[PDB]
Amino acid sequence: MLDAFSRVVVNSDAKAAYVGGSDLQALKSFIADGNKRLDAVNSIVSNASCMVSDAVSGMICENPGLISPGGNCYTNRRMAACLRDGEIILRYVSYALLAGDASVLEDRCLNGLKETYIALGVPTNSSIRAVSIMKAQAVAFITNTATERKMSFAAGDCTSLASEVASYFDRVGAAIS
């Protein structure tokens, strides 16, 4: 895997370049908000065990076809496996948000995740929503705008990091499709 620092390396390696002064202004502005990025994902992991149970129970109340007899969440195994890979894609989006790049996403979680969901007959349009319900929960916790939890945090702008995790969840939503 890579990070947000070493993404600038491989974009400068292919043109045989040293990282010059104009390309260092992005990384110095990256580490200027480095306190905010650690403050961001500390809100997410602290509410992570309730966020998945917020998510996958919100899809049963949105669509009752999963708890049909013979459905994909009919079995206590198959519900628990729907809990199990609901928090892994939460675990990897928190890895990518701290790393500042999706370089952990498409190679430790998203390789072959689509066609393993194809081979079981997993309803993908529900899992489009099951990713996106955690996108609605992630933008609230990173802005402290969640309507049942106001956390102790320093004031200031955080909206670009809100779009950064919003640009990570549709990456999971694209490769599932």
Partner 1 sequence: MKSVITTVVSAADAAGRFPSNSDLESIQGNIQRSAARLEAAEKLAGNHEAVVKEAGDACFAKYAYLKNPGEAGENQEKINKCYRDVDHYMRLVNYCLVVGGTGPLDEWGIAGAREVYRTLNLPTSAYVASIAYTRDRLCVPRDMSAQAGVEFSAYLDYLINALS
Partner 2 sequence: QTGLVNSKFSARMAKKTAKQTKNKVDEYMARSVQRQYKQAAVATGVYGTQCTEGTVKGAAEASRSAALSRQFRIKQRSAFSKAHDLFEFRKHAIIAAAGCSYEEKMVTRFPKLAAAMVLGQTEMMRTCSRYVVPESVEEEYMAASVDKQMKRRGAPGGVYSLSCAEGVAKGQAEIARVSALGAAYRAASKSASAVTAERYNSMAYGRVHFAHGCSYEEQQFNKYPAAAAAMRSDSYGY
Ligand X SMILES: C=CC1=C(C)[C@@H](Cc2[nH]c(/C=C3N=C(/C=C4\NC(=O)[C@H](C)[C@H]4CC)C(C)=C\3CCC(=O)O)c(CCC(=O)O)c2C)NC1=O
Chain residues that interact with ligand X, rule: CB under 6 A: 35-36, 38-40, 42, 47, 50-51, 53-54, 56-58, 60-62, 66-67, 72-79, 81-82, 84-86, 88, 109, 113, 116, 120-123, 126-127, 130, 133, 136-137, 140-142, 144, 146-149, 153-156, 158, 161
Report CA 120 to chain centroid distance, whole Å: 23
Residue 61 is labelled as binding a ligand: yes
| 115, 148, 152, 156: residue in contact with partner 2 (rule CB under 8 A) | 115
- The residue range among 95-103, 125-133, 139-147, 167-175 that interacts with partner 1, by the rule CB under 8 A, is 95-103
**Which amino acid is located at 138 in the chain?**
A
Return the closest-CA partner of residue 85 out of 114, 61, 65. Answer: 114
Distance CA 159, CA 37 (A): 12
CB under 8 Å to 124, separation ≥6 — which residues?
A: 117, 176, 177
Distance CA 94, CA 44 (A): 8
- The residue range among 7-15, 51-59, 128-136, 154-162 that interacts with its own copies, by the rule CB under 8 A, is 7-15
Q: Is 23 in the site for its own copies (CB under 8 A)?
A: no
CB under 8 Å to 115, separation ≥6 — which residues?
A: none
Q: Is 11 in the site for partner 2 (CB under 8 A)?
A: no
Q: Write each residue from 62 to 81 as x if it is in contact with partner 2 (CB under 8 A), else as -, in one continuous string.
A: ---------------x---x
